């Protein structure tokens, strides 16, 4: 489904995203905002390495989830890419946490550097009371 700004903020906080590995809820919101406009069904193909980004955090099926047709698939989240397109974002969140587990952090998503880094991300959570 398509979350409302503050609704997602409350949900992410509920799922332990606030401060996870130093990443503030504000930063996670800004990420979801530009990656999928808060849409759990958002999917994007990559006519390069032939992979696909799934869910609110646009997690790629090449190294994180298994869609069943991507070269060099590792599926570190040990999840089916379809599980990252449900109204309940528990699985997508856990796989997102897996992604930032690595040294690159949230900078793994180029959109963060371009749309969130050194920006007033507080606004994404402002007025939500989180």
């Amino acid at each position: 489904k398509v979350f409302e700004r503050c609704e997602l903020a409350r949900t992410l906080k509920r799922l332990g995203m606030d401060g996870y590995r130093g990443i503030s809820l504000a930063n996670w919101m800004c990420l979801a905002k530009w990656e999928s406009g808060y849409n759990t069904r958002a999917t994007n193909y990559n006519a390069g390495d032939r992979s696909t980004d799934y869910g609110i955090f646009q997690i790629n099926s090449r190294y994180w989830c298994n869609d069943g047709k991507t070269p060099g698939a590792v599926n570190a989240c040990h999840l089916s890419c379809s599980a990252l397109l449900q109204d309940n974002i528990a699985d997508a969140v856990a796989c997102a946490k897996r992604v930032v587990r690595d040294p690159q952090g949230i900078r793994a998503w180029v959109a963060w550097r371009n749309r969130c880094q050194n920006r007033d991300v507080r606004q994404y959570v402002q007025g939500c009371g989180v």
Partner: nanobody
Amino acid sequence: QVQLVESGGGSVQAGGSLRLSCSASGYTYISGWFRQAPGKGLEWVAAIRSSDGTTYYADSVKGRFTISQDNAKNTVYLQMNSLKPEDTAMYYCAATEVAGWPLDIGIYDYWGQGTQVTVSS
């Protein structure tokens, strides 16, 4: 972060039963139970994915122990039925935040204090 508090350990006769509890102070994604004999290593026993309720068991305990979760109490349990002397060990519950293979100890970042389970012949 997240604290895990265990309880329910005990000393029983062979064939006995116990119910271990692992209460969390915050959100947990995957929860699991591990056992350890004195001076030996940690061994995976069981796990459950809180999102879909999928459970996983070690061959040695399948059919005898049941892992469950009461979301309203944010607590995970290990119901140990038909205990055997070989089950004697200190049991630890653990939780993960990241997604991964429930059988991989590497993804568990939070651990309970442990509780002793002793089964006599």
